[PDB]
Write a protein that binds this ligand. Sequence first.
Ligand SMILES: CCN1c2ccccc2C(=O)N(C)c2cnc(Nc3ccc(C(=O)N4CCC(N5CCN(C)CC5)CC4)cc3OC)nc21
Length: 123
Amino acid sequence: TNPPPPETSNPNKPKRQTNQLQYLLRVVLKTLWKHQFAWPFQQPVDAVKLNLPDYYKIIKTPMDMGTIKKRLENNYYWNAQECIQDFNTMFTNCYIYNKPGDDIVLMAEALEKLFLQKINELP
Ligand SMILES: CCN1c2ccccc2C(=O)N(C)c2cnc(Nc3ccc(C(=O)N4CCC(N5CCN(C)CC5)CC4)cc3OC)nc21
């Protein structure tokens, strides 16, 4: 019922660790990960356990911080833009599937505000 999760390693994808990617893991990801509202975003949406039979009919580019964390740890990304895009996709999916005022949308907005503050200080 769930799709395979996004890959976190790919032996054919060139790997890199720039100073910006280092900041993305050690400052940006870590700051969001320890936030009180991180828990919905620390693993893929489990549409089986959450009883969301239409989630992966609507969301075709799933992303979550657990995936992002592993990608960063594995040096999966070539540049910071790829990682920033993954964060943006995660938030966007939440806004697509849910509705204004839903608790989960308010949590995403709080996390996104923090993300934006930290990205503004990228090396
Ligand atoms: C969260 C809402 N939601 C969605 C729901 C419907 C549709 C889309 C989404 C969605 O867009 N996203 C990103 C989500 C991604 N992932 C999850 N995962 C999880 C959801 C619930 C639990 C859970 O039952 N508990 C137990 C209760 C606990 N409460 C703490 C707050 N306290 C006041 C009261 C107790 C929180 C954890 C655990 C989860 O995973 C660890 N839910 C998501």
